[PDB]
């Protein structure tokens, strides 16, 4: 099965899922970085403006709903959400699955008022699941219908004409149509985490970063590529970038001349051109241009670690292999 994704300014890739009977529609981000499923709840206090601006699941309108009520809190790198568990059938690209998910009753204005989407569908392992809830992918696999025990991600560059798919997720395989050359895999380090060993990070003619090795979380739910504050501060000064709020910028006229950034993964340099990681929205020296890379200090046992998000995935088609506990990359097309 495939799920069509929408691309909002290269920073938000979301698809749709139906919940309940009849189906209640939601826009969600598919996050390989987490393992729970959640959407805003109709029981969410309207004092939270983000709940006023998003689709809300109403259990009282679903005849397939199954109550549970266990409270859970989901902590993500850029924000937190709180609520309770409920069970109901969920549709994902034609596949129907009974799923335990979180109904959110607390959703902070920042950052959710900036979300064009409603909720989240974690694509991570149960090991990372809060409340020890079974992940939606495991449940689909239990049906023993997917041809393969893997799922692929394709993130298109944002177009100006809404007739080009923003992105695509293939459940149970990959779409040859969106990648060329051969896949190149790297076995996962830790157990139950889409994280792999990174052999090095170079900025031009200097492997000035991650020498001696580091970790890399392949994160579909991340807009930018991220490293530890320390790593970023070093990379950024090597780029002549200045930190504004919590991200970096360069003088637009300087963006095109920025150097290549490479990530050594499983013996294979994955190179990002400046055109690949800078939002070139001008060429003026009188304007600032943002970089799709910022600091993100992820706590142990998963972090410290770099995180490869949409900036990276946009260039390299990614396949997440469950059976072989590995990740594969291939030139996107
Ligand atoms: C084990 C952990 C690391 C996994 C992590 O929890 C998970 O991958 C998901 C959760 C989910 C977080 C919320 C919903 C989708 C995914 N992802 C994140 O939290 C990421 C931050 C991150 C961690 S590592 C990396 N590289 N980037 N968060 C983002 O990329 C946000 C998404 C976003 C949130 C709200 C509105 C609009 C866009 N965009 S953003 O960074 O450019 N910016 C931030 C400030 O507000 C405005 C948007």
């Amino acid at each position: 099965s495939s799920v069509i994704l929408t691309n909002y300014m290269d920073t938000q890739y979301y698809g749709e899922i139906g919940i309940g009977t009849p189906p209640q529609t939601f826009k969600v981000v598919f996050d390989t970085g987490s393992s729970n499923v959640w959407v805003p709840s109709s029981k969410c206090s309207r004092l939270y403006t983000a709940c006023v601006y998003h689709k809300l699941f109403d259990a009282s309108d679903s005849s397939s709903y199954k109550h549970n009520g266990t409270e859970l809190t989901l902590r993500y790198s850029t924000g937190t959400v709180s609520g309770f568990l409920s069970q109901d059938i969920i549709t994902v690209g034609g596949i129907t699955v009974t799923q335990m998910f979180g109904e959110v009753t607390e959703m902070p204005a920042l950052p959710f008022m900036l979300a064009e989407f409603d909720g989240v569908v974690g694509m991570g392992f149960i090991e990372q699941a809060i409340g020890r809830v079974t992940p939606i992918f495991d449940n689909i696999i239990s049906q023993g219908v997917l041809k393969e025990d893997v799922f692929s991600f394709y993130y298109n560059r944002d177009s100006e004409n809404s007739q080009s798919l923003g992105g695509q997720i293939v459940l149970g395989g990959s779409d040859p149509q969106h990648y060329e050359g051969n896949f190149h895999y790297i076995n996962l380090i830790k157990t139950g985490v889409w994280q792999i060993q990174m052999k090095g990070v170079s900025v031009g003619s200097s492997t000035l970063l991650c020498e001696d090795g580091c970790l890399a979380l392949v994160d579909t739910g991340a807009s930018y590529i991220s490293g530890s504050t320390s790593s970023i501060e070093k990379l950024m000064e090597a780029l002549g970038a200045k930190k504004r709020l919590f991200d970096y910028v360069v003088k637009c006229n300087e963006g095109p001349t920025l150097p290549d950034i490479s990530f050594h993964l499983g013996g294979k340099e994955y190179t990002l051109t400046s055109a690949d990681y800078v939002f070139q929205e001008s060429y003026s020296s009188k304007k600032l241009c943002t970089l799709a890379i910022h600091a993100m200090d992820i706590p142990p046992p998963t972090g410290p670690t770099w995180a490869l998000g949409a900036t990276f995935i946009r260039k390299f088609y990614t396949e997440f292999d469950r059976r072989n506990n590995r990740i594969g990359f291939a030139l996107a097309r």
Side-chain angles (χ1 to χ4, degrees):
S1 295
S2 67
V3 177
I4 301 303
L5 300 178
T6 289
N7 179 180
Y8 179 66
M9 316 196 87
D10 266 8
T11 56
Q12 295 174 46
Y13 292 84
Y14 51 95
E16 293 218 347
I17 71 172
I19 305 189
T21 309
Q24 297 192 200
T25 281
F26 291 96
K27 304 177 185 193
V28 295
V29 170
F30 289 78
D31 183 24
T32 49
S34 57
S35 302
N36 287 72
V37 176
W38 71 263
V39 300
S41 168
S42 63
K43 301 193 183 192
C44 172
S45 168
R46 298 309 190 286
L47 263 338
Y48 288 108
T49 314
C51 282
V52 162
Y53 276 70
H54 289 94
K55 180 64 78 64
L56 308 177
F57 175 79
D58 203 328
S60 63
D61 290 334
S62 172
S63 68
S64 37
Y65 166 71
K66 284 289 207 298
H67 163 279
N68 179 285
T70 288
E71 313 206 306
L72 80 173
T73 292
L74 275 10
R75 283 192 235 278
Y76 303 106
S77 149
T78 45
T80 306
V81 283
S82 210
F84 60 92
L85 299 175
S86 292
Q87 197 195 70
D88 208 325
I89 65 185
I90 298 186
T91 301
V92 199
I95 293 185
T96 292
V97 185
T98 292
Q99 179 68 220
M100 256 287 156
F101 62 98
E103 279 196 64
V104 165
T105 52
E106 293 163 310
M107 193 175 56
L110 289 62
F112 298 111
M113 274 304 278
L114 305 167
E116 279 300 316
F117 50 91
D118 302 299
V120 178
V121 165
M123 296 307 283
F125 301 75
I126 185 174
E127 286 80 319
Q128 301 313 313
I130 301 300
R132 309 180 288 290
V133 187
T134 304
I136 198 170
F137 198 69
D138 302 41
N139 280 167
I140 293 182
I141 273 170
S142 285
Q143 304 192 176
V145 306
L146 292 184
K147 175 169 180 166
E148 302 153 66
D149 197 345
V150 309
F151 59 87
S152 303
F153 270 73
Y154 166 69
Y155 283 175
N156 196 180
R157 294 168 176 58
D158 183 9
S159 74
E160 192 142 352
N161 55 173
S162 294
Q163 53 179 178
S164 63
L165 73 176
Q168 177 199 267
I169 297 171
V170 176
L171 258 30
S174 298
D175 187 352
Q177 204 118 66
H178 289 130
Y179 70 90
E180 36 175 44
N182 277 169
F183 268 124
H184 286 82
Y185 311 81
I186 296 82
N187 293 78
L188 305 175
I189 293 188
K190 191 63 166 61
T191 308
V193 187
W194 293 114
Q195 195 184 223
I196 59 173
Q197 180 73 221
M198 180 149 59
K199 302 204 293 179
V201 177
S202 74
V203 181
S205 310
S206 68
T207 297
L208 32 64
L209 299 176
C210 168
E211 315 98 334
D212 296 348
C214 56
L215 283 50
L217 187 60
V218 185
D219 199 2
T220 59
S223 297
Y224 300 172
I225 275 173
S226 67
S228 64
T229 298
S230 317
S231 307
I232 297 314
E233 297 182 313
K234 194 175 183 304
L235 204 193
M236 289 303 164
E237 79 153 43
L239 296 180
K242 294 154 287 286
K243 171 193 174 187
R244 280 197 309 196
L245 265 184
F246 304 97
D247 58 15
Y248 293 71
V249 304
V250 164
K251 289 160 192 162
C252 295
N253 62 302
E254 284 165 344
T257 75
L258 294 188
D260 292 357
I261 299 179
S262 302
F263 308 86
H264 198 169
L265 312 175
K268 183 57 195 65
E269 290 301 311
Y270 287 82
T271 313
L272 288 188
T273 269
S274 59
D276 297 322
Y277 68 86
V278 41
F279 292 85
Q280 198 65 220
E281 304 188 65
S282 184
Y283 292 110
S284 174
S285 66
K286 295 183 187 300
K287 277 182 184 169
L288 296 173
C289 271
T290 305
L291 303 182
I293 306 166
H294 52 184
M296 217 61 53
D297 294 312
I298 310 162
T302 292
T305 175
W306 288 74
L308 301 180
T311 310
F312 190 94
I313 302 172
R314 208 177 290 127
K315 181 164 175 175
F316 307 104
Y317 185 97
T318 302
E319 175 193 70
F320 295 84
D321 194 342
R322 270 296 197 73
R323 181 185 304 189
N324 309 99
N325 296 299
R326 61 173 190 181
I327 297 181
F329 288 122
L331 229 209
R333 60 194 305 187

Coordinates of all heavy atoms in Angstrom, one line a residue, residues 11-12 29 31 33-34 38 75-79 111-112 114-117 119-120 217 219 221-226 294 296 298 302 307-309, ligand 1:
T11 N 8.8 21.6 4.8 CA 9.0 21.4 6.2 C 8.0 20.5 6.9 O 8.2 20.1 8.0 CB 9.1 22.8 7.0 OG1 7.8 23.5 6.8 CG2 10.3 23.6 6.6
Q12 N 6.9 20.3 6.2 CA 5.9 19.4 6.8 C 5.3 18.4 5.7 O 4.6 18.8 4.8 CB 4.7 20.2 7.3 CG 5.1 21.1 8.5 CD 3.9 22.0 8.9 OE1 2.8 21.6 9.0 NE2 4.2 23.3 9.2
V29 N 1.7 13.3 10.4 CA 3.1 13.2 10.0 C 3.4 11.7 10.3 O 3.0 11.2 11.4 CB 4.0 14.1 10.8 CG1 5.4 13.8 10.5 CG2 3.7 15.5 10.5
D31 N 6.2 9.6 11.5 CA 7.4 9.7 12.2 C 8.2 8.5 12.6 O 7.8 7.7 13.4 CB 7.1 10.5 13.5 CG 8.3 10.8 14.4 OD1 9.4 10.9 13.9 OD2 8.1 11.0 15.6
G33 N 10.7 8.6 14.0 CA 11.4 8.9 15.2 C 10.6 8.6 16.5 O 11.2 8.7 17.6
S34 N 9.4 8.2 16.4 CA 8.6 7.8 17.6 C 7.8 6.6 17.2 O 7.8 6.1 16.1 CB 7.7 9.0 18.0 OG 6.8 9.4 17.0
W38 N -1.4 9.5 17.6 CA -2.2 10.4 18.3 C -2.8 11.4 17.4 O -2.3 11.8 16.3 CB -1.5 11.1 19.4 CG -0.5 12.1 19.0 CD1 0.9 11.9 18.9 CD2 -0.7 13.5 18.7 NE1 1.5 13.1 18.5 CE2 0.6 14.0 18.4 CE3 -1.8 14.3 18.6 CZ2 0.7 15.4 18.0 CZ3 -1.7 15.6 18.3 CH2 -0.4 16.2 18.0
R75 N 6.5 13.0 24.6 CA 7.5 14.1 24.5 C 8.3 14.0 23.3 O 9.0 13.0 23.0 CB 8.4 14.1 25.8 CG 7.8 14.6 27.1 CD 8.8 14.8 28.2 NE 8.4 14.1 29.4 CZ 7.5 14.5 30.3 NH1 6.9 15.7 30.2 NH2 7.3 13.8 31.4
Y76 N 8.3 15.1 22.5 CA 9.0 15.1 21.3 C 10.1 16.2 21.4 O 10.0 17.1 22.3 CB 8.2 15.4 20.0 CG 7.0 14.4 19.9 CD1 5.7 14.7 20.1 CD2 7.3 13.1 19.4 CE1 4.7 13.8 19.9 CE2 6.3 12.2 19.2 CZ 5.0 12.5 19.4 OH 3.9 11.7 19.2
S77 N 11.1 16.2 20.5 CA 12.1 17.2 20.6 C 11.6 18.6 20.5 O 12.2 19.5 21.2 CB 13.1 16.9 19.5 OG 13.7 18.1 19.0
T78 N 10.6 18.9 19.7 CA 10.2 20.3 19.6 C 8.9 20.6 20.3 O 8.4 21.8 20.2 CB 10.1 20.7 18.1 OG1 9.4 19.7 17.3 CG2 11.4 21.0 17.5
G79 N 8.3 19.7 21.0 CA 7.1 19.9 21.7 C 6.5 18.7 22.4 O 6.9 17.6 22.2
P111 N 4.6 24.4 19.5 CA 4.6 24.7 18.0 C 3.3 24.3 17.2 O 3.3 24.5 16.0 CB 5.7 23.8 17.5 CG 5.5 22.6 18.4 CD 5.2 23.1 19.8
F112 N 2.3 23.7 17.8 CA 1.2 23.2 17.0 C 0.3 24.2 16.3 O -0.3 23.7 15.3 CB 0.4 22.2 17.9 CG 1.2 21.0 18.3 CD1 1.6 20.8 19.6 CD2 1.6 20.1 17.4 CE1 2.4 19.8 20.0 CE2 2.5 19.1 17.7 CZ 2.8 18.9 19.0
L114 N 1.5 26.0 14.4 CA 2.3 26.2 13.1 C 2.2 24.9 12.3 O 2.7 24.8 11.2 CB 3.8 26.4 13.4 CG 4.1 27.6 14.3 CD1 5.5 27.5 14.7 CD2 3.8 28.9 13.6
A115 N 1.4 23.9 12.8 CA 1.2 22.6 12.1 C 0.1 22.7 11.1 O -1.1 22.9 11.5 CB 1.0 21.5 13.1
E116 N 0.4 22.4 9.9 CA -0.7 22.3 8.8 C -1.4 21.0 9.0 O -2.4 20.7 8.4 CB -0.1 22.4 7.4 CG 0.2 23.9 7.0 CD -1.0 24.7 6.9 OE1 -2.1 24.3 6.5 OE2 -0.9 25.9 7.4
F117 N -0.8 20.1 9.8 CA -1.3 18.7 10.0 C -2.0 18.7 11.4 O -1.9 19.6 12.2 CB -0.2 17.7 10.0 CG 0.9 18.0 10.8 CD1 1.0 17.6 12.1 CD2 2.0 18.8 10.3 CE1 2.1 17.9 12.9 CE2 3.1 19.1 11.1 CZ 3.1 18.7 12.4
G119 N -2.2 15.3 13.5 CA -1.6 14.4 14.5 C -0.3 13.7 14.0 O 0.4 14.1 13.1
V120 N -0.1 12.6 14.6 CA 1.1 11.8 14.3 C 0.9 10.3 14.3 O 0.1 9.8 15.0 CB 2.3 12.1 15.3 CG1 3.5 11.2 15.0 CG2 2.6 13.6 15.3
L217 N 20.2 9.2 13.6 CA 18.8 8.8 13.6 C 18.2 9.2 12.3 O 18.3 10.4 11.9 CB 18.0 9.5 14.8 CG 16.6 9.0 15.1 CD1 16.6 7.5 15.4 CD2 16.0 9.8 16.2
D219 N 15.2 10.2 10.7 CA 13.9 10.7 11.1 C 13.0 11.3 10.1 O 13.1 12.5 9.7 CB 14.2 11.7 12.2 CG 13.1 12.0 13.0 OD1 12.0 11.4 12.8 OD2 13.2 12.9 13.9
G221 N 10.1 12.2 10.7 CA 9.3 13.3 11.3 C 10.1 14.5 11.7 O 9.7 15.3 12.5
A222 N 11.2 14.6 11.0 CA 12.1 15.8 11.3 C 12.1 16.6 10.0 O 12.3 16.1 8.9 CB 13.5 15.4 11.7
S223 N 12.0 18.0 10.2 CA 12.0 18.9 9.0 C 13.5 19.0 8.6 O 13.7 19.0 7.4 CB 11.4 20.2 9.4 OG 10.1 20.2 9.7
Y224 N 14.4 19.3 9.5 CA 15.8 19.5 9.2 C 16.7 18.4 9.6 O 16.3 17.4 10.3 CB 16.3 20.8 9.8 CG 15.6 22.1 9.5 CD1 15.8 23.2 10.1 CD2 14.6 22.1 8.4 CE1 15.2 24.4 9.8 CE2 14.0 23.2 8.1 CZ 14.2 24.4 8.8 OH 13.6 25.6 8.4
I225 N 17.9 18.5 9.2 CA 19.0 17.6 9.6 C 19.4 18.2 11.0 O 19.4 19.5 11.1 CB 20.1 17.6 8.6 CG1 19.8 16.6 7.5 CG2 21.4 17.3 9.3 CD1 20.8 16.6 6.4
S226 N 19.7 17.4 12.0 CA 20.1 17.9 13.2 C 21.3 17.2 13.8 O 21.6 16.1 13.6 CB 19.0 17.9 14.3 OG 18.7 16.5 14.6
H294 N 19.6 22.5 12.1 CA 19.6 23.2 13.4 C 19.9 22.2 14.6 O 19.9 21.0 14.4 CB 18.3 23.9 13.7 CG 17.1 23.1 13.5 ND1 15.8 23.6 13.7 CD2 16.9 21.8 13.3 CE1 14.9 22.6 13.5 NE2 15.5 21.5 13.2
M296 N 19.7 20.0 18.0 CA 18.7 19.2 18.6 C 19.3 18.2 19.5 O 19.9 17.2 19.2 CB 17.9 18.4 17.5 CG 16.4 18.3 17.7 SD 15.5 19.8 17.8 CE 16.0 20.6 16.3
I298 N 19.1 15.4 21.8 CA 18.3 14.3 22.1 C 18.9 13.5 23.3 O 20.1 13.1 23.2 CB 18.2 13.4 20.9 CG1 17.8 14.2 19.7 CG2 17.2 12.2 21.1 CD1 18.1 13.6 18.3
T302 N 19.0 7.2 23.4 CA 19.0 7.3 22.0 C 20.1 8.4 21.6 O 20.8 8.2 20.6 CB 17.6 7.8 21.5 OG1 16.7 6.7 21.6 CG2 17.7 8.2 20.0
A307 N 20.6 13.6 13.4 CA 19.3 13.1 13.0 C 19.1 13.6 11.5 O 19.1 14.8 11.2 CB 18.2 13.7 13.9
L308 N 18.9 12.6 10.6 CA 18.7 12.9 9.2 C 17.2 13.0 8.9 O 16.5 12.0 8.8 CB 19.3 11.8 8.4 CG 20.8 11.6 8.6 CD1 21.3 10.5 7.7 CD2 21.5 12.9 8.3
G309 N 16.7 14.2 8.6 CA 15.3 14.5 8.3 C 15.0 14.8 6.9 O 15.8 14.4 6.0
Ligands
LIG1 C1 13.7 10.7 19.3 C2 13.2 12.1 18.9 C3 14.5 12.9 18.5 C4 12.2 12.1 17.8 C5 11.3 13.3 17.5 O1 10.5 13.5 18.7 C6 10.4 13.0 16.3 O2 11.3 12.8 15.2 C7 9.3 14.0 15.6 C8 8.1 14.3 16.5 C9 7.0 15.2 15.9 C10 7.0 16.6 16.5 C11 5.6 17.3 16.3 C12 4.8 16.7 15.1 C13 5.6 16.0 13.9 C14 6.8 15.2 14.4 N1 10.1 15.2 15.2 C15 10.5 16.3 15.9 O3 10.4 16.5 17.2 C16 11.2 17.4 15.1 C17 12.5 18.0 15.7 C18 13.8 17.2 15.4 C19 14.3 16.2 16.2 S1 15.7 15.5 15.6 C20 15.7 16.5 14.1 N2 16.6 16.5 13.1 N3 14.6 17.3 14.2 N4 10.3 18.5 14.8 C21 10.2 19.1 13.6 O4 10.9 18.7 12.7 C22 9.2 20.2 13.6 C23 7.8 19.6 13.2 C24 6.7 20.6 13.3 C25 6.0 20.7 14.5 C26 4.9 21.6 14.7 C27 4.6 22.4 13.6 C28 5.3 22.4 12.4 C29 6.4 21.5 12.2 N5 9.6 21.2 12.6 S2 10.8 22.4 13.0 O5 11.7 21.7 13.8 O6 11.1 23.0 11.8 N6 10.1 23.7 14.0 C30 10.3 23.5 15.4 C31 9.7 24.6 16.3 O7 8.3 24.7 15.9 C32 8.0 25.0 14.6 C33 8.7 23.9 13.7

